[PDB]
Write a protein that binds this ligand. Structure first.
Ligand SMILES: *[C@@H]1O[C@H](CO)[C@@H](O)[C@H](O)[C@H]1NC(C)=O
Lengths: 394, 147, 50
């Protein structure tokens, strides 16, 4: 049983591919083997993505795992919908209901808005990056109307990096007109470190400031720098290293040879990579539920040209979708479940705060229970008041 | 398909339209295949070669008009159809010129029950007693709002 | 260490008691805010040194 699948990995996704390989090994069975056809292309380039898709389609694949950018996302969602091809991706969730797309990344929009109310914020700065779509930006802006917030949104993305200093100085110059002390960083693991470094340089990392890293990888970045500064830093973590499941994964991951497995000799793992590993498990359980369900879907490498007109969708694809979307297993990113569209449901996102001793989970966020705080209260706080005795005498 | 079809037919230039979703496809192919693409649609957010845009950039004219009326606090109802290029414009300028902009995506409003949404829309535009609104929409979405 | 604990912001004043003020890296505590003074024996403004 040889199931051929496509793999679209953006140049530079070393740890992601390394995690993709480890998944192939951990979830390899005798019942059937997955044959990944890897294609390293510039994910941003829409044209290239189109070729890589039609190429993997002519090779006759049953499913495709890859990534997309804010620019190429429309290409994938469109083709996969027309050709009834299933596309599994750890990338940011699609802004809508696009069929034949499985998204490993849970929606953070909800967890973010809940955290803001927890700290009871009414006026804050929102530094965003247009890389993962303004889906979360619209979220905070729309909620700013209802909850009545004074949000200062600033696109920290289009900043040219070969002279990006007179821009940051002019950035926190506007964030001083209103004396902004509460900032939300909605950026990638990289753009965050750049900002964090600048923050320390200008000294805006001392007590009084409060930063919120708007990503699923709070511990993915270096925090040792703004850890002793004084400013409170909060964020979100999807990979709970306290789970015996994840703890066991790291035990083998941290030992792997960094030569064969690039950027894999660490005690931690980027949430993007962790989702890639969980993606393999989903594809395995999906193709397995098709064998046990007595469903024939097999074909050959003659699907033909994807530009074929009229384009006829192979009916066997409809079943492959109902398989992946029906999958429900336990992975590094907590309980994995899907709806009819492909968006993850019944998941859990741990809310993190950065203390002196390091990061610490102060609670979690459920799509049905909102935010729920867990034990951690430093009870008490010198509450030991003073007992004053007195007599009733006018 | 329509692009590759017209390309196989051996054309010298292509005139058409694109959406916020298909725009990347056109700009990419036309750049790779060195095919010229003339379009009246919204200008591309960047410098994409082999693309001729008939529509001038309104971003500039809008910002200038705001200062003319001397606006400091206004509501900005936008539609994600023509890209948030102008939205980013007013938001970025809101930092410099110090404006209190209330941006609201009036696009994702489902039209088969779009009434309890408008009532809840001007309910938020009443918390701050917004009297100055900017409608960044198509000729159609504008009439709906105006009505 | 000063930068780490954040004692390099406005309000602090350091004096480097050596003849090599520009000999060390100052780009780090340069934008901090705290005033830093010192001593220089090698004048790079002299045509001789230049
Ligand atoms: C929802 O998720 C929880 C936590 O993983 C799980 O225990 C439960 O079975 C799920 N609910 C259903 C009905 O699938």
């Amino acid at each position: 049983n040889s199931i051929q699948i496509g793999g679209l990995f953006p140049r530079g996704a070393d740890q992601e591919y390394s995690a993709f390989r480890v998944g192939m090994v951990q979830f390899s069975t005798s019942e059937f083997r997955l044959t990944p056809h890897i294609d390293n292309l510039e994910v941003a380039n829409s044209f290239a993505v189109t070729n890589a898709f039609c190429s993997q389609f002519s090779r006759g694949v049953y499913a495709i795992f890859g990534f997309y950018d804010k620019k190429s996302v429309n290409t994938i969602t469109s083709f996969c919908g027309t050709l009834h091809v299933s596309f599994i991706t750890p990338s940011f969730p699609t802004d809508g209901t696009h069929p034949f797309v499985i998204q490993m990344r849970p929606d953070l929009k909800g967890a973010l808005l809940s955290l803001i109310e927890y700290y009871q914020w009414d006026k804050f700065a929102y530094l965003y990056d247009s890389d993962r779509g303004l889906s979360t930006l619209q979220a905070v802006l729309d909620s700013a109307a209802e909850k009545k917030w004074q949000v200062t949104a600033i696109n920290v993305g289009n900043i040219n990096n070969d002279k990006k200093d007179e821009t940051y100085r002019s950035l926190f110059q506007d964030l001083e007109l209103k004396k902004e002390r509460r900032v939300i960083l909605d950026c990638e693991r990289d753009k965050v470190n750049d900002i964090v470094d600048q923050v320390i340089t200008i000294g805006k990392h001392v007590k009084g400031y409060h930063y919120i890293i708007a990503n699923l990888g709070f511990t993915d970045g270096d925090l040792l720098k703004i850890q002793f500064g004084g400013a409170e830093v909060s964020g979100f973590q999807i990979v709970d290293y306290d789970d015996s499941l994840v703890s066991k994964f790291i035990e083998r991951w941290s030992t792997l040879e960094e030569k064969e497995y690039p950027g894999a000799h660490t005690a931690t793992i980027k949430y993007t990579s962790a989702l890639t590993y969980d993606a393999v498990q989903v594809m395995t359980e999906a193709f397995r539920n098709l064998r046990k369900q007595r469903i024939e879907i097999s074909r050959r490498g003659n699907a033909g040209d994807c530009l074929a007109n009229p384009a006829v969708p192979w009916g066997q694809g409809v079943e492959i979708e109902r398989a992946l979307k029906q999958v429900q297993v336990e992975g590094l990113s907590g309980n994995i479940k899907f709806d009819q569209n492909g968006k993850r449901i019944n998941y859990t996102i741990n809310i993190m705060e950065l203390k002196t001793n390091g990061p610490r989970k102060i609670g979690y966020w459920s799509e049905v229970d909102k935010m729920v705080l867990t034990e951690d209260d430093t009870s008490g706080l010198e509450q030991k008041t003073v007992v004053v005795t007195t007599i009733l005498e006018s």
